[PDB]
Design a protein around this motif. Sequence first.
Motif, PDB file in Angstrom:
ATOM      1  N   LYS A 158     -32.781   9.503  17.300  1.00 18.40           N
ATOM      2  CA  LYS A 158     -31.577  10.014  17.015  1.00 18.40           C
ATOM      3  C   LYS A 158     -31.188   9.587  15.429  1.00 18.40           C
ATOM      4  N   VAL A 159     -31.777   8.049  15.128  1.00 19.78           N
ATOM      5  CA  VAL A 159     -31.012   7.244  13.862  1.00 19.78           C
ATOM      6  C   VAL A 159     -31.592   7.651  12.707  1.00 19.78           C
ATOM      7  N   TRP A 160     -31.618   7.082  11.270  1.00 13.80           N
ATOM      8  CA  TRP A 160     -32.222   7.631  10.366  1.00 13.80           C
ATOM      9  C   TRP A 160     -32.700   5.694  10.142  1.00 13.80           C
TER      10      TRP A 160
HETATM   11 CL   LIG Z   1     -29.177   9.521  10.743  1.00 12.66          CL
END
Ligand SMILES: [Cl-]
Length: 138
Positions: free
Chosen positions: A49-51
């Motif tokens: 869920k992390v860019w």
């Molecule tokens: Cl993010």
Amino acid sequence: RSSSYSGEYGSGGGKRFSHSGNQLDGPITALRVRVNTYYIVGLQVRYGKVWSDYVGGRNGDLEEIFLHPGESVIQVSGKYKWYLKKLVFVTDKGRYLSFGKDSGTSFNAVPLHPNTVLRFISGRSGSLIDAIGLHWDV
Ligand SMILES: [Cl-]
């Protein structure tokens, strides 16, 4: 040893980057690619869920594609000159996630070892994407 690396595709300008730390956040789940008239300008990849931290420049339009749950990238083809021009992410759900302009020197990256998928990217960037590398693993 199941890990493998395809690359580096492109040229020697800009500064090196690597998403090696990011695979701990999760599998690749989305892609952002900034594109202009000629080039791939920037990249961001979502791990779980992390860019990732954004790399590359600001002179282009942002394109974004979400992968379906459980979808993996199994091949990456593309085109470059002095800078990256095209990327196509081929998935195990049969999608061809395409970005950029269909021009330049062609490359076609596939993993070396059995049942590996794209786990992270590395490359070089400045105001554009100078180069890209693909890291495959279980
Ligand atoms: Cl993010």
